[PDB]
Amino acid sequence: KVGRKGVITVKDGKTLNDELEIIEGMKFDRGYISPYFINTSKGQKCEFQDAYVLLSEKKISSIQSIVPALEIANAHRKPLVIIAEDVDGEALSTLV
Amino acid sequence: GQAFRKFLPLFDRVLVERSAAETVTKGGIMLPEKSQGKVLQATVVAVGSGSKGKGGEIQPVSVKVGDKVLLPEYGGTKVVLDDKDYFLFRDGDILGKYVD
Amino acid sequence: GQAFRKFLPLFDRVLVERSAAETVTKGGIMLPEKSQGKVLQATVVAVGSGSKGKGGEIQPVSVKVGDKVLLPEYGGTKVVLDDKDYFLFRDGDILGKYVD
Amino acid sequence: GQAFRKFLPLFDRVLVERSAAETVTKGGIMLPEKSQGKVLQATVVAVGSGSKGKGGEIQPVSVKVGDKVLLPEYGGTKVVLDDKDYFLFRDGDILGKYVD
Amino acid sequence: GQAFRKFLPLFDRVLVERSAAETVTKGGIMLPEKSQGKVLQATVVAVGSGSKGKGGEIQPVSVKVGDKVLLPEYGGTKVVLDDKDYFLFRDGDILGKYVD
Amino acid sequence: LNRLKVGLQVVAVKAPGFGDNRKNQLKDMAIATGGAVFGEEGLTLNLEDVQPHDLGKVGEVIVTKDDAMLLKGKGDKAQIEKRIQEIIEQLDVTT
Numbered sequence: 001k002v003g004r005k006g007v008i009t010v011k012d013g014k015t016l017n018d019e020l021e022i023i024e025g026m027k028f029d030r031g032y033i034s035p036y037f038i039n040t041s042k043g044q045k046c047e048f049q050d051a052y053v054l055l056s057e058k059k060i061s062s063i064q065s066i067v068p069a070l071e072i073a074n075a076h077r078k079p080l081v082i083i084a085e086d087v088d089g090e091a092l093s094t095l096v
Numbered sequence: 097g098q099a100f101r102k103f104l105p106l107f108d109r110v111l112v113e114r115s116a117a118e119t120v121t122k123g124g125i126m127l128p129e130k131s132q133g134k135v136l137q138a139t140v141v142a143v144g145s146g147s148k149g150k151g152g153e154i155q156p157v158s159v160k161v162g163d164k165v166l167l168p169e170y171g172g173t174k175v176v177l178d179d180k181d182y183f184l185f186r187d188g189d190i191l192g193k194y195v196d
Numbered sequence: 197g198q199a200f201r202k203f204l205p206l207f208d209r210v211l212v213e214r215s216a217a218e219t220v221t222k223g224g225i226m227l228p229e230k231s232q233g234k235v236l237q238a239t240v241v242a243v244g245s246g247s248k249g250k251g252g253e254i255q256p257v258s259v260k261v262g263d264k265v266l267l268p269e270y271g272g273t274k275v276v277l278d279d280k281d282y283f284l285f286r287d288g289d290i291l292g293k294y295v296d
Numbered sequence: 297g298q299a300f301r302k303f304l305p306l307f308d309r310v311l312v313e314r315s316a317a318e319t320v321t322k323g324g325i326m327l328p329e330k331s332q333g334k335v336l337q338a339t340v341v342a343v344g345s346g347s348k349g350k351g352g353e354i355q356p357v358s359v360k361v362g363d364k365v366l367l368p369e370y371g372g373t374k375v376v377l378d379d380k381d382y383f384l385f386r387d388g389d390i391l392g393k394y395v396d
Numbered sequence: 397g398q399a400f401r402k403f404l405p406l407f408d409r410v411l412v413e414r415s416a417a418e419t420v421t422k423g424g425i426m427l428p429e430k431s432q433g434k435v436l437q438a439t440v441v442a443v444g445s446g447s448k449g450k451g452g453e454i455q456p457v458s459v460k461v462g463d464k465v466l467l468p469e470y471g472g473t474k475v476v477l478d479d480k481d482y483f484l485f486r487d488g489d490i491l492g493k494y495v496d
Numbered sequence: 497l498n499r500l501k502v503g504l505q506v507v508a509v510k511a512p513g514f515g516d517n518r519k520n521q522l523k524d525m526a527i528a529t530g531g532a533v534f535g536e537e538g539l540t541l542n543l544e545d546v547q548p549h550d551l552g553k554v555g556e557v558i559v560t561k562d563d564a565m566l567l568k569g570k571g572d573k574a575q576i577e578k579r580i581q582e583i584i585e586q587l588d589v590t591t
């Protein structure tokens with residue numbers, strides 16, 4: 001599955017039998033910032049299709065810094081995922 | 097001077113009412129009521145009699161009731177009239193006047 | 197100038213008595229006597245002779261005894277007259293005058 | 297006074313627009329937008345009516361709309377007109393005027 | 397007023413150019429360029445129109461372009477003209493004038 | 497002071513739970529009684545403009561030194577069921 005030079009790791013199981021689990025894509029161990037963003041009841045998951053991706057290396061703080069992106073997203077009627085160093089109080093409150 | 101709601105500013109003091117703050121952007125996004133801070137748009141509601149600072153006879157105030165004005169960010173004294181907010185300025189503090 | 201209770205303010209000083217503070221809301225709920233703070237409604241009880249700050253002849257005070265006025269929140273000197281409280285202002289400090 | 301974009305400065309206040317900052321050196325090297333700080337070159341866009349500080353009749357403002365000026369580094373009040381930035385000065389604060 | 401290099405000071409402002417600092421002592425010992433600090437010798441290059449602080453008509457500036465002057469140690473506003481340094485003073489700040 | 501001088505029927509009690517647990521109980525009570533939660537970070541509802549329909553209704557309340565009780569809330573059954581369903585789903589996700 002992962003090629004002869006892929007990454008394989010060993011972890012403790014909680015079951016009687018061993019299992020093989022395949023990880024595709026990108027796992028980076030960060031959760032949702034705000035529970036308000038949840039849109040799927042079964043499992044409390046955020047599921048979106050054809051989303052825009054915003055990558056910010058620095059923390060996102062200002063209303064002036066955030067408004068243009070949300071305006072673009074609403075104009076194009078597409079979901080937006082914001083990956084940023086952090087979200088400050090004002091931006092977080094406005095988003096939620 | 098011209099009184100407003102049974103109140104008249106004295107000398108060159110000017111009474112104005114600020115307009116309501118913007119609540120929705122040009123799009124469909126409305127803004128939290130904590131972010132607007134203070135708005136500098138106001139309408140003149142009452143006018144004083146004249147400047148005591150002029151030597152000799154006092155000159156009349158340069159603005160009239162009903163004028164629309166741009167206010168400074170730093171002045172103003174809080175007063176309450178029938179639960180609506182008004183601010184008292186001197187003629188010299190008003191940044192600008194609007195005309196139609 | 198016009199004296200009041202054997203006292204006369206000098207020059208452009210103005211003597212006023214604040215009205216009693218509100219004690220019951222518009223409903224039936226009355227308010228604790230610690231919460232009203234200070235009230236800006238007062239009635240003019242005595243008037244000075246005229247402003248020393250005018251060059252040449254002194255001009256008369258713009259207010260008359262018996263006028264009802266809106267006071268500022270920051271001025272006033274404490275004086276006691278027959279155990280009732282009065283405050284001394286300059287003509288320039290009064291925020292407003294009431295008319296009927 | 298002469299109004300600009302439906303706005304007129306009052307008395308001896310002067311409204312100006314700063315020119316765009318330099319972005320490329322005399323060579324081909326362009327400069328980061330954080331390093332220019334503030335530019336003192338501006339063009340006069342609106343002019344007030346006259347100085348209240350003159351005794352007697354107010355004198356007209358010494359500058360006219362369209363003049364090019366050198367500004368000081370320390371003054372100015374922030375105002376927003378149709379998302380373009382302007383600054384309000386007194387006639388006395390302008391360091392210089394440009395002529396052609 | 398008299399303009400200099402397309403620039404004219406306003407009102408009673410005076411534009412001057414400081415002379416070059418001394419670099420060699422009376423002997424043959426020349427001095428490091430960090431030790432002279434600031435020199436108070438300057439030549440008047442431009443002159444304003446007149447003092448706004450005079451009541452009534454403005455009086456002309458007491459100095460003329462080309463005069464040599466002794467400056468104070470504490471005043472001056474930095475301006476750049478074609479990469480040569482000039483300083484703006486009021487007529488009242490100049491310590492002295494030189495005559496030949 | 498008002499209660500003493502008028503007999504006004506009012507009582508006040510501390511919010512239970514600490515941290516997000518407090519918020520969870522507050523919302524759960526909001527659905528249970530049919531009221532609303534004021535001051536939420538999202539959709540902040542102001543105390544200055546409280547409305548009669550924003551307050552919950554309870555048939556009986558008993559308060560003592562150690563505890564307080566509301567017995568017969570008036571929350572709508574459909575939202576109550578929604579809340580119970582979401583809670584059991586959260587219970588099933590992570591343990």
